[PDB]
Amino acid sequence: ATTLKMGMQASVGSVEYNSAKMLADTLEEMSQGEIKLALYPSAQLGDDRAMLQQLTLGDLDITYAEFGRMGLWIPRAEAVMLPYVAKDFDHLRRMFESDFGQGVRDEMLQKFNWRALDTWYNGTRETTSNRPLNSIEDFKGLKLRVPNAKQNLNYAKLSGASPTPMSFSEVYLALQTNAVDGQENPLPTIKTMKFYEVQKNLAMTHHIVNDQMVIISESTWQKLSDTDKDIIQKAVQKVGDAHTQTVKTQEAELVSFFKSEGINVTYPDLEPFREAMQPLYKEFDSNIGQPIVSKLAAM
Amino acid sequence: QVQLVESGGGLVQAGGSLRLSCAASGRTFSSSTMGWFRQAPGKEREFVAGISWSDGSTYYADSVKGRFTISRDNAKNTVYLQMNSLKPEDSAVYYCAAERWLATPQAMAVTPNALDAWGQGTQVTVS
Numbered sequence: 385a386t387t388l389k390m391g392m393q394a395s396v397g398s399v400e401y402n403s404a405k406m407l408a409d410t411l412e413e414m415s416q417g418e419i420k421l422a423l424y425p426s427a428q429l430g431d432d433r434a435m436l437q438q439l440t441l442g443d444l445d446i447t448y449a450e451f452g453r454m455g456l457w458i459p460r461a462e463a464v465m466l467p468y469v470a471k472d473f474d475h476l477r478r479m480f481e482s483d484f485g486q487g488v489r490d491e492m493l494q495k496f497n498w499r500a501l502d503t504w505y506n507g508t509r510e511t512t513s514n515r516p517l518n519s520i521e522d523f524k525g526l527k528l529r530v531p532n533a534k535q536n537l538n539y540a541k542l543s544g545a546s547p548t549p550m551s552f553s554e555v556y557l558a559l560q561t562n563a564v565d566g567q568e569n570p571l572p573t574i575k576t577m578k579f580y581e582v583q584k585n586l587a588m589t590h591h592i593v594n595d596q597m598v599i600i601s602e603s604t605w606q607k608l609s610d611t612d613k614d615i616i617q618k619a620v621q622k623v624g625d626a627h628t629q630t631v632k633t634q635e636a637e638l639v640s641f642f643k644s645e646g647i648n649v650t651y652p653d654l655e656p657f658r659e660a661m662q663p664l665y666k667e668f669d670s671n672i673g674q675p676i677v678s679k680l681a682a683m
Numbered sequence: 684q685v686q687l688v689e690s691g692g693g694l695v696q697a698g699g700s701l702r703l704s705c706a707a708s709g710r711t712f713s714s715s716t717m718g719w720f721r722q723a724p725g726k727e728r729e730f731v732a733g734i735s736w737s738d739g740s741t742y743y744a745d746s747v748k749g750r751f752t753i754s755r756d757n758a759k760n761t762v763y764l765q766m767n768s769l770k771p772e773d774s775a776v777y778y779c780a781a782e783r784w785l786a787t788p789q790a791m792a793v794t795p796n797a798l799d800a801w802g803q804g805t806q807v808t809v810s
Binding site: 387389395396397398404405408420421422423424425426428 | 736782787789794
């Protein structure tokens with residue numbers, strides 16, 4: 385039998401990790417145990433950049449990574465993680481399957497020995513606030529907590545809010561005291577930190593859509609039998625369907641939980657947001673040398 | 684599901700030795716990382732030791748390293764926590780835990796309530 389090593393920053397009990405175990409179960413079934421999967425969670429081998437280098441060298445067999453995260457090595461890939469470029473996951477999936485996506489996935493393989501087998505939906509960031517946000521006009525003046533990360537800052541800046549960097553442990557009390565007016569995160573994070581206790585409103589801003597690519601080392605892929613390749617390919621697709629459905633289900637359950645706890649959930653029109661991000665798309669189109677963003681948005 | 688059952692426990696003297704056993708019911712034990720937790724009365728749960736299935740790695744909490752030893756017997760589908768040089772600090776309910784496919788044991792402690800299987804613990808009283 386063969387044992388493949390899979391590493392990830394997520395921890396036990398997470399959806400990424402539960403889907404890795406379902407992949408391990410599925411590989412045991414479809415191979416009669418000829419394939420077994422050993423899981424290294426909690427960034428015990430390093431962060432995604434480190435485990436991606438381990439895939440390049442063949443020291444790690446499989447790992448997760450976002451499509452946009454390739455922008456550190458393949459700069460045009462950052463386009464898909466610019467705010468509001470991806471309208472929903474099926475749009476981000478159509479970008480993954482597009483000529484643009486195939487070209488990135490070709491460059492991943494030929495340069496870095498990363499074979500991307502599939503992409504999975506991993507949730508969407510939404511915005512909570514102490515006052516209702518029914519349109520982009522309400523964002524003016526909003527003290528909005530973002531991580532110190534380029535695109536989350538740009539989302540706050542260009543919607544008209546006042547981006548407020550702050551360490552994650554300090555935010556609950558800052559929302560409680562209204563020192564900060566709101567924050568933006570995935571819905572499971574909002575329940576996890578119990579931000580809903582100190583936030584009366586939740587806007588479905590859908591400003592950032594997240595994916596996980598499932599990447600296997602080409603050095604491992606070349607050593608595998610073509611039967612095993614087919615088993616792995618089919619197992620990843622089967623588990624990705626379930627992973628995407630699990631995330632979509634938990635978001636719907638969390639919105640229903642927030643509505644049951646008295647939270648006002650707003651659904652603003654997002655085309656004003658898309659038009660408000662155009663200065664950031666222009667900065668990207670010009671630095672990348674090709675008008676790419678208008679191209680992904682129209683898919 | 685997986686059924687885990689502990690053996691061993693009871694009263695022991697300070698400085699004494701005790702061996703805990705944990706037998707697993709199915710045929711997933713050879714592909715499961717195994718661990719030992721403990722909860723002393725009134726305190727939080729502490730991950731004590733763990734042992735891998737794939738790369739043989741072990742974990743110990745600093746409070747027991749150098750005087751607990753963990754080991755595995757796949758032929759009997761059993762893990763052992765061998766408590767040498769026991770201290771009153773060690774008095775607690777001890778719990779056996781299993782997690783399939785996980786390769787690295789220290790990660791069991793991060794979200795213990797999500798782990799695959801648990802035994803209903805065994806009390807160890809040190810005098």
